[PDB]
DNA sequence: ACGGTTACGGT
């Protein structure tokens, strides 16, 4: 395998990437992240800066992807991965939601068939240098 | 059934 920029991923494949967590949302069914590497993808939602009432502060346009975490991925991350953290996600599955937007999914995988994972990366890892420099262009 | 639909809500 190898890592891809969010700009390079497409629907219905397995992929790995480094990203920054912008937004998290827990429910009693799953844990959801919205992550960016500050590269654009035409299948991402165009986040608006004009919204009345939003805690989103960017990036705006098509720069972030929703990640739905199920089961062990959910339970592990829900009280651990926080907005602003950096993460590395490996071998996750992509699909398209009902409105045609790219989206990434971590199903429960007890049989350990897929080797999926998500861990925090220390804010200072040099693997984050690109995300950090690109971010400079949008702030 | 292996699920949750919409870019907020801020649980």
UniProtKB/Swiss-Prot annotation:
It comes from the Eukaryota. It is found in: Nucleus; Chromosome, Telomere. Belongs to the telombin family. Single-stranded telomeric DNA-binding protein that is required to protect the 3'-end telomeric overhang. It binds the consensus sequence 5'-GGTTAC-3'. Regulates telomerase and telomere length. Self-associates. Interacts with ccq1, poz1 and tpz1. This is Protection of telomeres protein 1. The chain holds residues 199 to 337 of 555 of the full protein.
């Amino acid at each position: 395998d190898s890592f891809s920029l969010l700009s390079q991923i497409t629907p219905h494949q397995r992929c790995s990437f480094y990203a920054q967590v912008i937004k998290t949302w827990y429910s009693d069914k799953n844990f959801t992240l919205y992550v960016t590497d500050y590269t654009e993808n035409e299948l991402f939602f165009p986040m608006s800066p004009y919204t009345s009432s939003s805690r989103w502060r960017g990036p705006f346009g098509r720069f972030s992807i929703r990640c739905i975490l199920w089961d062990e991925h959910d339970f592990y991350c829900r009280n651990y991965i926080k907005e602003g953290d950096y993460v590395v996600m490996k071998n996750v599955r992509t699909k398209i939601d009902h409105l045609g937007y790219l989206e990434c999914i971590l199903h429960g995988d007890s049989a350990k068939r897929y080797n999926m994972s998500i861990e925090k990366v220390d804010s200072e890892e040099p693997e984050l240098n690109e995300i950090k420099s690109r971010k400079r262009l949008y702030v």
